[PDB]
């Protein structure tokens, strides 16, 4: 209901970054606050009443403004500040409060190279009739990267899908995990199970594999 | 953890969503309970709120559809939520203003970890729990085929092992289930015990499987 500007930002660890928040009414009695939100967690109040920082919290961040317009600096962005911020307004005393939009910070590091795993499907899964492959790039950065399937050096489509974890709190880079996903029959059909990882972290194509049995 | 949230997980439309939030210790606050939730890749949308004089406020949409209220023998709040749609699958949190005030977000310094609820037609399933064992060194946890997506919950050696941990968000496999993994790195030295504990509430799924090379 509040105005959150901008809807994203990124900068490098180190850099002083600022977030605003706009409202329509005046805030009541100084109550404006900024939480800050991590993946899978709940939003955490890092500052109250425009500009007090709650315990524990780095002096990096501050706030300021009054009335309708409100500012949150972090003065040195970390990896462990990705997050969703949003402010958070009363206007009166009845039940005029409400949430900003929230504001996304994202952090720019050096291109650093992930760490490539493969896992074959687990016997407890083969006593069923299916068949799951999964391959793991670890700690890389930027987020960019291709998977691709080879069984048998034939490369497979639709069958796979992947899910990435948000940055890392301390080294700032994502971790990613692929799955392939083959019947049973399917898979005892075939012999070398590859993963091969295009990133920009890499001289080449990094490809990791197995034989089954 | 302090706030305590409890709920049912999935929720077939046209139900009543009956949510609790236990302050599980005791404090010396005379505290105020409020009410948000935040719908799957959205911002925060305040729902209610109860004062520390147990005076309850409701947001402009809730307050045709939404009951708040404390039981204090028990330090349970609850929100019930009647005539569920897709519309109300979101993660529904509680938080804790430190003022007693029952109509306020600039202040919520404590906050439950959120339950998830999801409001669909489709089926509860547990699922099945498979080991991604070692060929650093990295092992894991396949957490496949089930729905709905959350409340689910991984922890590693029944929570002493935290460093190093990724848990993927999950993704929605063409089967219409959920599939999940959670990986973490190791020194090649694995001689020592790693169980992996998933717990899936709407399913009543608690398996501790052990991932041996």
């Known amino acids: 209901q509040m105005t959150q500007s901008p809807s994203s930002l990124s900068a490098s660890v180190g850099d002083r970054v600022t977030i605003t928040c706009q409202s329509i009414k005046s805030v009541y009695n100084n109550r404006l606050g900024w939480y800050q939100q991590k993946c899978g967690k709940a939003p955490k109040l890092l500052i109250y009443?425009?500009?007090i920082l709650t315990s524990g919290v780095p002096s990096r961040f501050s706030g300021s403004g009054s009335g309708t317009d409100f500012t949150l600096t972090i003065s040195s962005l970390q990896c462990e500040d990705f997050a969703t911020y949003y402010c958070a307004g009363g206007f009166d005393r009845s039940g005029d409060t409400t949430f900003g939009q929230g504001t996304k910070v994202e952090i720019k590091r050096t291109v650093a190279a992930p760490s490539v795993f493969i896992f074959p499907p687990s016997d407890e899964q083969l006593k069923s009739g299916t068949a799951s492959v999964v391959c793991l790039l670890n700690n890389f950065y930027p987020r960019e990267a291709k998977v691709q399937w080879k069984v048998d050096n034939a490369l497979q489509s639709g069958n796979s899908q992947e899910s990435v974890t948000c940055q890392d709190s301390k080294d700032c880079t994502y971790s990613l995990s692929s799955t392939l996903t083959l019947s049973k029959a399917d898979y005892e059909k075939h012999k070398v199970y590859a993963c091969e990882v295009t990133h920009q972290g890499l001289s080449s194509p990094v490809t990791k594999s197995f034989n089954r049995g | 953890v302090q706030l305590v949230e409890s709920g049912p997980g999935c929720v077939k439309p046209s139900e009543t969503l009956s949510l609790t939030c236990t302050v599980s210790?005791?404090?010396?606050?005379?505290?105020?309970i409020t009410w948000i939730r935040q719908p799957p890749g959205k911002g925060l949308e305040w729902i209610g709120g109860?004062?520390?004089?147990?005076?309850?406020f409701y947001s402009s949409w809730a307050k045709s559809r939404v009951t708040i209220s404390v039981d204090t023998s028990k330090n349970q709040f609850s929100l019930k939520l009647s005539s569920v749609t897709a519309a109300d699958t979101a993660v529904y949190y509680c938080?804790?203003?430190?003022?007693?005030?029952?109509?306020?977000?600039?202040?919520?310094?404590?906050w439950g970890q959120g339950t998830c609820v999801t409001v669909s037609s489709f089926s509860t399933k547990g699922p099945s729990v498979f080991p991604l064992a070692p060929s650093t060194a990295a092992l894991g946890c396949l957490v496949k085929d089930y729905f709905c997506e959350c409340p689910v919950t991984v922890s590693w050696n029944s929570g002493a092992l935290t460093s190093g941990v990724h848990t993927f968000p999950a993704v929605l496999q063409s089967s219409g289930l959920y599939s999940l993994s959670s990986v973490v790195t190791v020194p090649s030295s694995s001689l020592q015990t790693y169980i992996c504990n998933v717990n899936h509430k709407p399913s009543n799924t608690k398996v501790d499987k052990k991932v041996e090379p």
């Open positions: 109860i004062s520390s004089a147990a005076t309850t």
């Open positions: 210790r005791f404090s010396l606050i005379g505290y105020a």
């Open positions: 009443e425009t500009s």
């Open positions: 938080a804790r203003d430190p003022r007693g005030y029952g109509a306020a977000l600039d202040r919520l310094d404590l």
